[PDB]
Structures are given as C-alpha cells and as structure tokens.
Design a protein around this ligand. Structure first.
Ligand SMILES: [Cu+2]
Ligand SMILES: [Cu+2]
Ligand SMILES: [Cu+2]
Ligand SMILES: [O]
Ligand SMILES: [O]
Length: 476
C-alpha cells in the first residue's frame, strides 16, 4: 500500500463575533487497521491550528464534551494566569469556558493541550493537542514558505502504545511514573509514516515533539541539512544550519529543508540517549514522514536575516531563584528495575558507560521541586512582573531527563545543563534541558497571575509532572 498523506490540521481564525469554537470530545481513530477510542479538539484526534495575530484579541469558547474534567493551556503563549489554563482552569464535563486572549508576543508556533491536575499525561496520550500559529507584521515581510498544508506544514510527532485489542494502553504506575509513558508506534499528525507532497524549493516544517516522555532528534535520510529558522518563542536572528535537531517534549522548532525533483527523502528521528527510548524500533533511525517532491516551483525564501535578537542584559543584581528538582530514590530504582526486567539491557542502550506501606510511600507524590510535590493550594513563590529574573534549575541527584518549562514567558537560556546553549537554542525558549546538571534561564513575566490561577513551572515529562514535579507561582 502507498503511504497515507500527511493529515493537515485546519487553520482556524475568528468569526464576526470574534470567536473560535473548540469542542473537546471522544471519538474513534484507526491505527494499523484497528479502531481505538481517542480524544480530539474539533474532531477525533489532535486538533486544529488556531491562528492568532500580535496585537489582536480573540475569544475562544471551549466546550468540554468529555465525561471528565479538563483544562486547556496555551503552551508558549504569554497570557495572564486567569486564562492560562493550568490545573486550576477547570472546565466541567458538559460545560463551557471562554477565554479572551490578547496576543502580545512575536510570531511563533505555539501549541495547546490539557493541564488537568494529575492526569495531563493520560489526556495528552488519549489524543488531545492542537497548534497555535502566531503571526505579526515582521514575519510576513520575510516571504517564507507560507502555503498551509503545501510548503508550510505542521509536523506533530508522538509515540503511543496500544493493547492487543487496539485501544491506547495508558497507565500511570510505578514504572511509568519513573521512566515516562512511551510506546512502539510513532505518529505524525496522528498517522503512521505518512507522505507529504511538497513543491520544489523550500519546505517549511513546524516541528512539535508532542510525546509524553520521549525525546526526539530529527534528521533527513540522505543527510541534507535542516535550516532552523525558529524556536519555541519565535524566529532566530538568522538561520542556523544543522545536520540533526534534538527536540525535547513540548518544544517546537521551525526548519526549512530543500526539496529537489525526483528525490524523495524521509524526515527521520535518530536514536536518543534516554532511558527506555532506544528499544526497537527506536534503536535505529526511525522514519517520521516521506517528503515526495512535486515538479512545481515553491515560492518561499530562506532569507539571510530573520529578526533582531536583543542582547542579554547584565545579570548583576537580578533575583536568583533556585529550583531543585528531585525524584524519590527508592521509587526511581523500583521503576528503573521494572524497565530493565521487562526489556533488558536494551532499555539502557546509548547511555553513558512489594507491600503497602501507606501514603508516605505513594508514587503519586514521589517527584518534587524544592522538597515539595506540587501543591495546587500553595504557590511556592511570588515572582516579579516586568523584571528579569535568573532561575536556576538543578537536576543534580538523578540522571533522568527533565525538560523544564515555565508558563507565562519566553525566556533566554544562559546555561543549558552546564554548557552555553547551542546557537539554535539561544533565542526565545520556553523549555530548557535539565539532566544530571544545572540550567539557568533569564525570564521576564509581562502578565499577572494570582494564587487562584497561578502559573506552573514543571518538567514536561508528563508522568513526572503528574506525580509532583511542578510548582505554582504568582506574578504581580
Ligand atoms: Cu506552558
Ligand atoms: Cu506544556
Ligand atoms: Cu504546562
Ligand atoms: O505548558
Ligand atoms: O505543560
């Protein structure tokens, strides 16, 4: 059989009432010929791409048609806590919540997903994620590839695992609370190994790692380069040529890749050095999608300069906040031993060379920041508004991967896990790697967040977030 075409999320803009309608619901999808119950926004799986313009407000009406509570967070969008959709932003089953978003940041590819307390990993795994395309006046002047679904395409890459009956097999248990939920099946906008027909010239891919716990590393099957033009929070100052592109959970990058007649190639993900993630079929480069060249000229450009990136300021006198991540040693060892028992030595490939004792030992609050598992009732601190701060995030104490995300901001990385950031990671970011070492980021919050609707800061390894590796903080 030929490959299926890459599904393209609809690009949604406002109605005359200036509203966008999102319905959250359950439906059915098919994977490898077997039906599965899945959840989607405005459909059975995944979601549309909401298009937003800097300096314009839009109202979003969000209808929860699930039979359980959910929330909707705009990952990467800088909005007041009241509309951020963290775990306090409950939408009752059968209810509706509306938010007005006043977009106040540069062009970027952001995304949106649930943030239900303790259940974010399951609700993402069941299918909920969508995209956000922010435009501004500056980016349109660059004449980048811009035909949605033709030469400008979103690529949401996610793994799943399924039980023998075809259903999604999600469990938050000691092993996945330790290593994360991951699977053996890779989806690209919900489809298994699709093809995308692209015109000759430049193809723009808006890459999102939407996996719960798996890190990815994109490359091409014939080693043509990727030109990074944008990170989580928008354009880089100039393109950065790379041969491979590591992407942590929740991160976005936009790249341009050349398309030449008669020479199809795959986008692939290369094996990563993360516990559990190099079990077959991920022990080898894994195709993500086939790019099928079409002998029609693509009009987009790769300009020499993309945007202005301001200088880091002086760090002297800035507030320094320390965030110590931690895992329970006993439960980390128990979860890792179950992984090893299940899959054997392959569960550590690529890495560097039973009774009930009560609630004190419960893995649901095993992961912590500054000695506390997430307490929705107690923001850990009150950050300054409109002031730069230096947040220092330490993973010393364990060797698991912690992609650390801070709501409410796009920051600058000063140190990523003990090294200055790579050039394509030196612009606007909302995620920073922490693994065995220490990161430092320069953040500023332009909007208020009160105790009742606090901003979150957390690991975006969802099973760790859900089992306590998150804090709340207020601004203003
Ligand atoms: Cu976020
Ligand atoms: Cu997020
Ligand atoms: Cu979040
Ligand atoms: O997020
Ligand atoms: O998140």
């Amino acid at each position: 059989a030929e490959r299926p075409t890459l599904p393209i999320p609809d690009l949604l803009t406002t109605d005359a009432r200036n509203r966008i309608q999102l319905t959250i619901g359950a439906g059915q999808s098919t994977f490898g010929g077997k039906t599965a119950t899945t959840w989607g926004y405005n459909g059975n799986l995944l979601g549309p791409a909401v298009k937003l313009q800097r300096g314009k407000a839009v109202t979003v009406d969000i209808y929860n048609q699930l039979t359980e509570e959910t929330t909707l967070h705009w990952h990467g969008l800088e909005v007041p806590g009241e509309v951020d959709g963290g775990p306090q932003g409950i939408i009752p089953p059968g209810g509706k919540r509306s938010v007005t978003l006043n977009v106040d940041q540069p062009a970027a590819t952001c995304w949106f997903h649930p943030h239900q307390h303790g259940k974010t990993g399951r609700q993402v795994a069941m299918g909920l994620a969508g995209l956000v395309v922010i435009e501004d006046d500056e980016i349109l002047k660059l004449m980048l590839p811009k035909q949605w679904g033709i030469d400008d395409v979103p690529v949401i890459v996610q793994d799943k695992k399924f039980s023998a009956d075809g259903q999604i097999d999600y469990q938050l248990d000691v092993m996945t609370a330790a290593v994360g939920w991951f699977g053996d099946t890779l989806l690209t906008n919900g489809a298994i190994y699709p093809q995308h027909a692209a015109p000759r010239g430049w193809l723009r891919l808006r890459l999102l790692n939407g996996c719960n716990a798996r890190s990815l590393n994109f490359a091409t099957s014939d080693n043509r380069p990727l030109y990074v033009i944008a990170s989580d929070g928008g354009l880089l100052p100039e393109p950065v040529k790379v041969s491979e592109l590591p992407v942590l959970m929740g991160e976005r990058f936009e790249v341009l890749v050349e398309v030449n007649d008669n020479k199809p190639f795959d986008l692939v993900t290369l094996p990563v050095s993360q516990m559990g993630m190099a079990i077959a079929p991920f022990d080898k480069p894994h195709p993500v999608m086939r790019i099928q060249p079409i002998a029609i000229s693509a009009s987009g450009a790769l300009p020499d300069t993309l945007s202005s990136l301001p200088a880091l300021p002086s760090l002297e006198g800035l507030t320094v906040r320390k965030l110590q991540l931690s895992m329970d040693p006993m439960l980390d060892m128990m979860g890792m031993q179950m992984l090893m028992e299940k899959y054997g030595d392959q569960a550590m490939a690529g890495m560097d060379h039973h009774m009930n004792h009560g609630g004190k030992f419960d893995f649901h609050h095993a992961n912590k920041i500054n000695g506390q598992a997430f307490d929705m009732n107690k923001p850990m601190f009150a950050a300054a508004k409109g002031q730069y701060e230096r947040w220092v995030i330490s993973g010393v104490g364990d060797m698991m991967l912690h992609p650390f995300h801070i709501h409410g901001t796009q920051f600058r990385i000063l140190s990523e896990n003990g090294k200055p950031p790579a050039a394509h990671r030196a612009g606007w970011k909302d995620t920073v790697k922490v693994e065995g070492n220490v990161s430092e980021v320069l953040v500023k919050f332009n909007h208020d967040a009160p105790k009742e609707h606090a901003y979150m800061a957390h690991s975006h390894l969802l099973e760790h977030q859900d089992t306590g590796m998150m804090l709340g903080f207020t601004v203003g």
